[PDB]
């Protein structure tokens, strides 16, 4: 048993679910790595083609978990499924997931995402099976439908599209973009940077691949899609499918003159979904923004848009010294604007108050119906107004459950070109 | 073996070798992280205390480039003599200053450690009575306050012997405000201290029952019953809170004390336990303006400030809470700065901690840090420590938590 306490309410939860974790956190009883971005490399199999005594134990575990999930442990379906996975592994060195299994696993990878504040919705995910895909064109078709379905004219809906799992390791399916919709980043001759500095490298690869950049500040980047190991290919997302929100302020009417807008759909496309030892290297998933993600990190990180400068200038704030708190004051107004713009354009968005409050309820639900809920306090607490949100005062146990979403190398570091 | 932390804003990479020198547990396991548990994981026998003393003396004589020296070996032999004869030992005045400064340096949760080497150590191990402690603590306060030009200081009382003669400051801080619950359920003063306020009142304290009553010192010497003493009001430096733009802010009637002085911790050096060691420095703005005034369990003046700010308080997404919080923290910094009372804003504080950290990696081989505590409780990502990876491990000497004395003390009078 392991108890967590909330210090605003004295609610104590008891955690047993953590007993079912397998992967090292990176911590030891002598050092805590809770603030390391990538604390561990304990993966469940060797990098590529696994042997039978390697793959099957994980497969047996997942199927066991899935059938245990639906009250059918040891049933005919369960015991045949096992024999079915054995022969597949024997005869193909891999195995294929049933549709139900794939959906269970996608959902429980989100459910186990200890960094995600949005998980109260984990059961409501739409899974798009794209395992039949064979080309970057087909990849591009699956993604456009994902984008269109998920955007739903602003009434955003969470979805994941799952492309063929990794086989030998070279025949990887990869979305080279980090998100499906990101703005481009242009290294300027005068040292500075136009657009999104996070994407300078990726923007240059696109240019290097033949992308003709319109060299603005909010240039939607092409899709760079790689299928069964081949060279990636540029596809331009139909603009009518990329919903965008112009940022304006409900009070400062000069705020719209800053010319800012952000895209409506956050869709993480460079991560790896892992289920029963299988590895889906292309699984773009999407939901809706927490407003701080755009207004705190995307606009106000130093290595990002860094618009605190401008916003505070137009607000007439003493930017001489830090003690005036001019960054804080502009930061709030930016995030107020971002929220008011998305809500005015009927585009789904949630503020950090609602979301954190939502996540407290999710934890409660999880400790009652599951015996625990893995949460990463460093990532749940929003990057502004930490202590006025309920999660700041909530103790959290962090631990690694499978299925999960894993990081993976940026493909251009590892891809032998053709 | 080495370990690397990265700053994701600057891409600076530091190599922690110091984490090897730790041997106290964090509470994390290999398969579970407890990094956000507030408190994770009678006294030392002879055999327990020998190596702890040995490790500390060894580390002391290393620090001063005297390891293996004649004085190093004689000191070791001297410490063993005492632990045999008396089942404990006594630190030298150098050792006490060195251990107290290093327990601060080793405090992973403190963002203010760039100052650790300028700690003023007051040795109070001759104290025998609560009156003696009042005297010592008053002198601490007068020295640390320095007419608003604050100075860092710890006052260290006799260590623990058998656990039945502990010195303890029952106050959590040396200056705090009282909290009184009302019949109607509301709270006058500081709701954090309601319990300790009741303990005082019960002990005979005649309370003013105002919003900012400085609490009495509840002092325990040699395991006797604690005793009440009123800090002389002229040694309590206070700052009336006003706002540089909102003339109406002074009408909130708010004030805070200028001297942060934590008194309920235990100082541990070489296996010795100093159960009473109040220490003080100066405030970071957010500790008063974010947590003291705006936690729902505390003064909860977001409510009022937003109202007078004419904010839309219906929907959260108006961020009225965020917007008012910023203004309360502007008011706090401007008030202190105006009254020339020392205060550091959270940007300057986090900046200095990154500098400190990198310096500690250069010369010491690492610097344990509790990201969950280092990040200020507001505007997290726009400070450099948010993007700073940090390794957390437990070095000794350290400051440690201990039970509240009214949970464990057994009484004497009547
Ligand atoms: C529906 C609304 C959602 C919201 C508001 C939300 C919010 C967040 C936030 C704020 C983070 C912190 C990362 C950052 O700040 O950049 C995060 C992380 C994450 N989210 Fe969610 N999320 C949502 C949906 C989803 C969905 C649909 C999935 C997958 C199916 C998902 C998977 C993840 C993962 C895997 C991580 C972090 C993984 C890691 O870094 O180890 N989220 N989320
Ligand atoms: C000189 C200026 C100082 C500043 C600005 C400062 C600031 C802080 C802050 C903001 C915290 C976080 C705690 C909270 O917010 O509740 C903290 C924790 C702490 N500080 Fe410092 N501090 C200072 C001096 C000192 C001194 C002089 C000592 C001891 C001699 C010390 C030891 C500690 C300890 C032990 C903790 C908490 C560790 C724990 O609770 O486990 N600090 N400090
Ligand atoms: C689906 C979804 C909805 C939503 N609203 N937000 C998110 C955030 O997704 C993620 C963001 C990051 C960024 C990490 N930072 C950049 C360098 C550090 C990493 C991940 F692994 C994520 F999964 C996802
Ligand atoms: C000397 C000094 C200067 C300064 N500016 N701030 C501090 C705050 O340090 C501390 C803060 C807390 C908060 C604990 N809360 C009760 C549950 C959470 C506990 C401690 F033990 C500290 F030491 C100390
Ligand atoms: C639950 C969580 O561990 C707790 O609220 C912590 C978080 N970080 C903190 N950080 C500081 N500086 N002070 C605190 O009291 C806390 N409390
Ligand atoms: C060093 C630190 O772990 C790193 O910057 C983390 C901190 N917390 C975060 N929290 C969220 N939500 N997103 C992030 O990218 C990060 N970055
Ligand atoms: Zn840990």
Q: Which of A283, A288, A326, A333 is catalytic?
A: A288
Which of A4, A334, A388 is most worth mutating to test chain B (most B CB atoms within 10 A of its CB)?
Answer: A388
Which one of B33, B319, B329 has the shortest CB-CB distance to A325?
A: B329
How many beta-carbon contacts under 8 Å exist across A and B? 216
Asked if A192 and A262 sit in the same domain, the reply is: no
Q: Which atom of ligand 5 is nearest to the CA of B38?
A: 3
CB burial of residue A161 (10 Å; 0-12, 13-18, 19+): buried
The H or E element that residue A3 is part of is strand A2-5
Instruction: Encode B266-284: b = buried (16+ Cβ within 10 Å), e = exposed.
Output: bbbbbbbbbbbbbbbbbbb
Yes or no, beta carbons of A30 and B26 under 8 Å apart:
yes
Q: Are A175 and A282 contacting, i.e. CB atoms less than 8 angstroms apart?
A: yes
Asked if B139 and B249 sit in the same domain, the reply is: no
The angle that helices A52-69 and A76-92 make with each other, rounded to 10 degrees, is: 160
Radius of gyration of chain A, Cα coordinates, nearest whole angstrom: 23
User: If you measure CA to CA, which chain A residue comes closest to B17?
Assistant: A31
Residue A386 placed within a domain: no
Q: Is A144 a catalytic residue?
A: no
Radius of gyration of chain B, Cα coordinates, nearest whole angstrom: 23
Give the closest residue to A305 by CA, choosing from A343, A256, A245, A262. Answer: A262
Between CA B138 and CA B146, with CA B142 as vertex, the angle to 5 degrees is 165
Tell me the chain A residues in contact with residue B318 when contact means C-beta distances shorter than 8 Å.
336
Q: Which long-range contacts (CB under 8 A, 24 or more apart) does B127-132 make?
A: B127/B157, B127/B158, B127/B167, B127/B221, B128/B221, B128/B222, B129/B221, B129/B222, B130/B219, B130/B220, B130/B221, B130/B224, B130/B226, B130/B227, B130/B229, B131/B227, B131/B229, B132/B221
Token look-up 């989100």 returns: A110
Residue A387 placed within a domain: no
Asked if B201 and B251 sit in the same domain, the reply is: no
C-alpha distance from B223 to closest chain A C-alpha (Å):
31
Q: What is the DSSP string of A159-200?
A: EEEEPPPPSSSSS--EE-SSBSS-B-EEE-TTS-EEE-GGGH
Token look-up 């994390």 returns: B28
Asked if B223 and B309 sit in the same domain, the reply is: no
Tell me which residue range forms the domain holding B170.
126-151+166-237+401-405
Residue B103 placed within a domain: yes
Distance CA(B357)–CA(B393), nearest Å, equals 14
Distance B75 CA to ligand 7 centre (A): 38
Q: Which residues face A290 on adjacent strands? A: A350
Distance CA(A235)–CA(A375), nearest Å, equals 37
B331 touches chain A (CB under 8 A): no
Q: Which of A233, A274, A293, A366 is catalytic?
A: A293
Provide the token pair at B259. Answer: 């001297």
Asked if A164 and A37 sit in the same domain, the reply is: yes
Ligand 3 probe mutation, A37, A38, A116, most atoms within 8 A of CB? A116
Residue A235 placed within a domain: yes
Yes or no, beta carbons of B389 and A37 under 8 Å apart:
yes
Q: Is A176 a catalytic residue?
A: no
Yes or no, beta carbons of B38 and A7 under 8 Å apart:
yes
Any idea which ligand is nearest the CA of A116?
Answer: 1
The H or E element that residue B219 is part of is strand B217-220
Asked if B158 and B53 sit in the same domain, the reply is: yes
Residue B20's alpha-carbon distances to B149, B258, B374, in angstroms, are 38, 38, 22
Give the closest residue to B391 by CA, choosing from A375, A34, A379, A40. Answer: A34
Residue B65 placed within a domain: yes
Asked if B101 and B34 sit in the same domain, the reply is: yes
Q: Are A158 and A122 contacting, i.e. CB atoms less than 8 angstroms apart?
A: no
Token look-up 């280092």 returns: B374
C-alpha distance from B283 to closest chain A C-alpha (Å):
13
Asked if A145 and A196 sit in the same domain, the reply is: yes
- CB proximity list for A159: less than 8 A, separation 6 or greater: A125, A126, A127, A128, A146, A149, A150, A285, A286
Give the closest residue to B256 by CA, choosing from B308, B186, B189, B304. Answer: B189
Asked if A126 and A22 sit in the same domain, the reply is: yes
Yes or no, beta carbons of B319 and A332 under 8 Å apart:
yes
Provide the token pair at A58. Answer: 């994980």
Asked if B339 and B201 sit in the same domain, the reply is: no
B337 touches chain A (CB under 8 A): yes
Q: Are A214 and A194 contacting, i.e. CB atoms less than 8 angstroms apart?
A: no
Q: Which atom of ligand 1 is nearest to the CA of A292?
A: 10
Distance CA(A381)–CA(A354), nearest Å, equals 12
Residue B413 placed within a domain: no
Residue A47 placed within a domain: yes
Yes or no, beta carbons of A323 and B3 under 8 Å apart:
no
Distance CA(B411)–CA(A321), nearest Å, equals 53
Distance CA(A126)–CA(A143), nearest Å, equals 14
Total tally of structural domains belonging to chain B: 3
Asked if A126 and A259 sit in the same domain, the reply is: no
- CB proximity list for B377: less than 8 A, separation 6 or greater: A386, A387, A392, B286, B290, B291
Residue B388 placed within a domain: no
Structure determined via = X-ray
Nearest CA residue ID for atom 2, ligand 6: B387
Q: Where are the beta strands (DSSP E) in A188-299?
A: 193-195, 223-226, 233-235, 244-246, 261-263, 267-268, 272-275, 278-280, 285-286
Yes or no, beta carbons of A296 and B382 under 8 Å apart:
yes
A41 touches chain B (CB under 8 A): no
Q: Which residues face B229 on adjacent strands? A: B217
Any binding-site annotation on B212? no
Listed by number, the residues of chain A in 351-380 with a beta carbon closer than 8 Å to a beta carbon of chain B are 351, 353-354, 377-378
Q: Are B263 and B169 contacting, i.e. CB atoms less than 8 angstroms apart?
A: yes
Asked if B198 and B272 sit in the same domain, the reply is: no
Residue B208's alpha-carbon distances to B150, B188, B298, in angstroms, are 28, 11, 20
Tell me the chain B residues in contact with residue A333 when contact means C-beta distances shorter than 8 Å.
323
Distance CA(A238)–CA(A216), nearest Å, equals 18
In chain B, what is the greatest distance between 2 CA atoms, to the nearest angstrom? 73
Q: How many CB atoms lie within 10 A of CB A136?
A: 22
A28 touches chain B (CB under 8 A): yes
Distance CA(B326)–CA(B333), nearest Å, equals 11
Ligand 5 probe mutation, A6, A8, A360, A387, most atoms within 8 A of CB? A387
């Amino acid at each position: 048993f392991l108890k967590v306490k909330n210090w605003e309410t004295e609610v104590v939860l008891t955690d047993t679910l953590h007993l079912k974790s397998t992967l090292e956190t990176g911590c030891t009883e002598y050092i805590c790595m809770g603030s390391i971005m990538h604390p561990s490399q304990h993966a469940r199999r060797p990098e590529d083609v696994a042997t039978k005594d390697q793959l099957f134990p994980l497969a047996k575990e997942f199927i066991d978990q899935y059938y245990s999930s639906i009250k059918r442990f040891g049933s005919k379906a369960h015991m045949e499924r096992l024999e079915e996975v054995n022969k597949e592994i024997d005869t193909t060195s891999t195995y294929q997931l049933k549709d139900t299994e794939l959906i269970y696993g996608a959902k429980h990878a989100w459910r186990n995402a200890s960094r995600c504040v949005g998980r109260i919705q984990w059961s409501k995910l739409q899974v798009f099976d794209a395992r039949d895909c064979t080309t970057a064109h087909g990849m591009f078709n699956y993604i456009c439908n994902h984008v269109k379905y998920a955007t739903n004219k602003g009434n955003l809906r969470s979805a994941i599209t799952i492309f063929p799992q990794r086989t030998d390791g070279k025949h990887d399916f990869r979305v080279w973009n980090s998100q499906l919709i990101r703005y481009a980043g242009y290294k300027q001759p005068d040292g500075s940077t136009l657009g999104d500095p996070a994407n300078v490298q990726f923007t240059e690869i696109c240019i290097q691949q033949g992308w003709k950049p319109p060299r603005g500040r909010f240039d939607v980047l092409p899709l760079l899609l790689q299928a069964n190991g081949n060279d990636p290919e540029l596809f331009q997302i139909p603009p009518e499918l990329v919903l965008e929100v112009p940022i304006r302020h409900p009070k400062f009417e000069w705020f719209k003159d800053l010319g800012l807008k952000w895209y409506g759909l956050p869709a993480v496309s460079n991560m790896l979904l892992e289920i029963g030892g299988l590895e889906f290297s292309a699984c773009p998933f999407s939901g809706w923004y927490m407003g701080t993600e755009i207004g705190v990190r995307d606009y106000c990180d130093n290595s990002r848009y860094n618009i605190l400068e401008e916003v505070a200038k137009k607000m007439n704030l003493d930017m001489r010294k830090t003690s005036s708190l001019w960054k804080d004051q502009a930061l709030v107004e930016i995030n107020i604007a971002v929220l008011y713009s998305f809500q005015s354009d009927k585009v789904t968005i949630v503020d950090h108050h609602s979301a954190t409050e939502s996540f407290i309820k999710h934890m409660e639900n999880e400790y009652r119906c599951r015996g625990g809920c893995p949460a990463d306090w460093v990532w749940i607490v929003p990057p502004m107004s930490g202590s006025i949100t309920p999660v700041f005062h909530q103790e959290m146990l962090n631990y690694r459950l499978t299925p999960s979403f894993e990081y993976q190398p940026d493909p251009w570091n590892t891809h032998v070109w053709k």
